[PDB]
């Protein structure tokens, strides 16, 4: 009956159901003293604390312990009364076959968990999967759907390219690149001097004003990503829809490109979500 | 019982059966991630995606992998219930003998395929072949049949000339020329500057308004093609029926020629089809 | 006085001067910790490390930062004592006009750089440019020069066609295709399962024996490239000289083609170089 | 003349000269009653006792009081008669520039110290520095040098990655992680109940059989470290040489990994040393 | 109804209820002659004198005879008329589970005692527990709450670290270190000569001017404690709130640190108290 959409991502998780929201992808099984105060979930005896700790960089996220984050997001989005729902997940546009390994472990399965001590249960009627980026096309405005466009999702580690003709797809591909590599680049020179920064606590340093990120590093990253699209797409053609958090991160620099026609998707963070979410309304409803 | 007509072409495929239509000749065996969303056919274990990828420029189209496009067109035109049909193909007016290599591989053969996962089968009672251009004469209006006319099909790569006396043919020939050479000419100067266009994604650029095609390039192409007909035909004589997509592409420029009597065939795209299609009604029915 | 020839390429750079050689086209401006141990060049304050990092896929290589690779190759080929030389570059047979943008930035210019810390300078008397593929004709054996031949360079991203009559050219063209597309095809199915390969570290995987490249993928690539030459050349005619690294990559499969007369150029890697290099001896000497 | 190599480390110090050996990195300036019985060194009036006390966890070990441990190791390795030597230190592969701050304070300097009351002096002709991990490659067996390998040093607090092509480096990086974090994890749950353990006296508890370390904690640590290498290296590729004491600590669990090609370096403790030590023979001798 | 907060500590006890205050943690069951004149409490027949004698150094203070000090503090803070109250204790941020052993022995229990001969009774409605250091965050000023801060309590024997994001915690840990170790260090060299000082009567000697504490011993202690926080926190980041009596003891030396942003909490002695005390108002009121 209900519908829930979850983009696990690699650094951020974005959920939309009865209530929408997002949080950080950090997950840790490390033992903790003051359990009351943190967000956590316990499944079949193993406990995990969310929003802190490691980052789960493993590629092919079909098997990167997509276990605690999913249930936590389901509990946060919907309410306790809800028991049966329809899940619509978003996988990268290249790892589709892994959905076979997904459905087998989820479809028609009842999951019981704690969610900060308030034990509850949940079941899912049927599971559905959509490519990343392609989903966002549905959230796109009508004025851009008619034309031949290119959905370009700039993920933390994955760039997703989906070229759409007039309501049809032509090209689909993925690139191993994203903001994580930029964070690694920054830490490569920061940790060198005397410091101990890592890819996790580095963005907050930029936000609070400790790391002085020169404007041209963003330009270098822009050139690098745009150097990873020429073999597959000519960005001057195929009016482009930038999506993902990296797009918001680089928008003021993207807007000054030598591209005839383009734009940065509004609410890009949830775009890939909302789009797929719209698709759900089309299928079950 | 049923009758189906298929013009494979070189850039476009045009089918007419219980339901008519057309699509692009692009075919690719390349591996694909998001199979659901594309049009495809799998035959004896090998899968091909239609409407995208390469273009299959091979001449003598009797052997240019006329395999996936044919079955896809048959499935799209007719319905699943249909099992036996009569196929009427259109070959160029010079490669007739290759029909011997065609019939042997098709007549009395049952083909099973997927067509986007919905497996089905189909058989063909008997195969029939007609020259290109000659077919369109049947689709022609009565007012032009009586006079001595010249059917001139301007294909993407082949120009077909068939001179008809009063219900009889006198001259028949083919020329290696068409819109593909024009696309090559345009890309020769476009790719030179900084770009990466090819013969496939170049027409769409003209359509959407990126390539500024000067009016006189069309005139140059017109002179080139009309320079390829003087040895065989005097266009002032032999009232001319222009057919093919190139005719629609150049019609407003053809209409201003110093020719006493001529015309551009209506629905030229399907003309060569409809004509031959009429012929089928004459033979089996 | 001296003469130096440099084929920048897109994946490999090939230099010949007083000392010949080649290396990889990978270039990175990324910050590096252990600078001693890598090959690098610093120009006007910006440092670049060669043989590692990105790949610079940008087409129209007249402006793809042809800056560090050039100076590094000049330093490696010649010696420190040399100050003035004559440069003979090789551009694709379609981007000639870009030579105007080249000469202006190079002719009569003195470049100072580090080359792994040993600072040095160099000047170039005059600059010269030759088409790709056409150059290799000079390196060709005499037995093939007399006949009407077709120089076919199979680059990593560009196919160069130059048809030569008896010591004269007739046809000249370029196609966007090469081994880079093959690498993209392989990674399209490899990255899908669970992996993280890209177009850079994929050839080494084939070489060391991790990727199982089926024999028929090479055949598919051969058909694709040979499907990109029919509109311009009939390979049965115009005895063919295959050049480029891709020719060595596919030679044992090229040798089994239904072509009456052909061959694979020896030392094809440097052929395009040596040929043009011979031309230099003709002009200045 | 003589050559001495010193790996200060963070928990253990490893020296090799005329006589090889190792000891603990614990250093304390705390006042002591029974000075006779402990190992100590007094430099310019300040006394320090080695093998007991604090642990000097400060990162960027270029300035973590690398003062008493160094002289103590020099005295223990060589003999009293020796006056002039050549020092070859090992720094992490990311803090190279700090060598500038090192040489200035050491090169051409005479150090006098007590070494348990037997006053002596020593001078160093010239100082040399090598990256950690990279050094161990020289100690590696010939059978592994030819292939493209990955030196992976698992330090107490630092993971050092150095990817070597055929006798050349491609990738170099550091991660803040090691056995110290594992000790912190263990104490996090041990100290909680009633105890007072710290990161220093915790390994001895495991060795003597008081802390019951479940087998799966080692697996968790293995996954954590292997989660810190995917962005930079694919361990299935790049045949891996594990080095460092942590490798010996986890070897029986490393040996059961799903890695096609790998190994644990013999005498890993001194590997990083011996390797660099070999390098010294190449330079001065 | 009433609310009472008690920080037992290890050397000092700090109570706040209807009347606030503090005293020394010294407790002795030793027989005493002149009982009138000392502060004491007798519980179930056993008498204890407060403010003199031993010091109760036992770690895991959930069971270090937290019996007489508690009742004495309750009697001193509130008045005789009060019978029922709500207790809010402060435990270290690592020994939470011991609260289970606490509540069972206190919740819903009536305690009768003497308190210097004036017999009285008291009951507690419900018991509540909070981590040390975390509590002080509530007492903190608003200007520091919004930012990502680090509460650092420097106890007599325990260092408590609690890293707070924007109103949320991320890291929580404890270290065995404090002013008691400093007192032990001082006595190690004082008792050596001819004296008989211990960890109890040593601070008073500093206060009254008998022990000449060199300024650099405080610096050594500062470095030692700051050497015990690098693995868990980078003090340059995470604006720091120093709390505890040791902070007041070292404040003039803390203020001269190379830290960009920090401060010493006002009334740090009661900070950990007041904070938790505020929390009580939030829960019951
Ligand atoms: N409000 C914001 N302002 C600036 N940058 C943001 C904001 N929200 C997210 N980002 C950036 O966008 C990135 C999030 O990418 P994300 O969409 O989580 O990757 P993926 O889609 O692959 O999961 C982060 O690295 C973050 O720096
Ligand atoms: N609706 C249209 N408007 C303008 N041009 C068209 C249209 N449809 C087709 N064309 C042009 O006609 C050509 C199609 O030729 P086609 O009939 O497919 O060749 P062939 O008959 O040899 O298969 C294309 O190159 C296209 O540019
Ligand atoms: N010794 C060799 N053996 C097998 N393949 C090779 C060898 N040398 C080069 N190649 C292949 O040839 C290609 C080099 O093409 P290249 O000549 O650099 O392109 P371009 O001429 O466009 O710069 C590479 O992709 C590589 O796989
Ligand atoms: N003989 C041994 N048996 C088991 N474990 C050992 C042995 N020797 C050292 N170790 C482990 O290896 C670690 C030493 O790491 P080390 O090489 O000193 O770090 P670094 O290289 O960063 O200085 C220690 O934590 C210790 O537990
Ligand atoms: N007014 C003061 N002036 C100077 N130092 C003080 C003062 N009050 C307390 N101290 C110091 O602070 C310490 C008290 O620490 P405390 O907060 O009791 O530890 P805990 O919080 O672990 O119980 C004592 O060692 C004392 O020397
Ligand atoms: Mg994403
Ligand atoms: Mg046709
Ligand atoms: Mg080339
Ligand atoms: Mg080490
Ligand atoms: Mg305290």
Numbering used by the authors:
A (entry chain C), B (entry chain E), C (entry chain D), D (entry chain B), E (entry chain A): 1 to 285
What does the paper say about this structure?
We recorded CryoEM images of the Cb-cParM filaments after polymerization with ATP or GTP for 30 min. The averaged images of Cb-cParM, polymerized with ATP, revealed obvious wide and narrow regions along the filament, indicating a possible strand crossover. One map corresponds to the first condition (ATP, 30 min), at 3.9 Å resolution. The map from class 1 at 3.5 Å resolution (GTP, 30 min) was very similar to that from the first condition (ATP, 30 min). The two models from the two maps (ATP 30 min, and class 1 with GTP 30 min), were identical up to the reliable resolution of the data, despite the difference in the bound nucleotides. The Cb-cParM filament reconstruction with ATP (30 min) was indistinguishable from that of class 1 with GTP (30 min). Phosphate release from Cb-cParM polymerized from ATP or GTP did not cause significant filament instability, as observed for other ParM systems, rather the filament underwent a significant structural change. The Cb-cParM cryoEM images showed obvious differences in the distribution of the nucleotide states between ATP and GTP at 30 min after initiation of polymerization.
ParMs generally exist on low-copy number plasmids where they contribute to plasmid segregation and stable inheritance. Here we report the discovery and characterization of two chromosome-encoded ParMs (cParMs) from the genomes of Desulfitobacterium hafniense (Dh-cParM1) and Clostridium botulinum (Cb-cParM). Both cParMs form filaments, exhibit nucleotide hydrolysis, and possess characteristic ParM subunit structures.
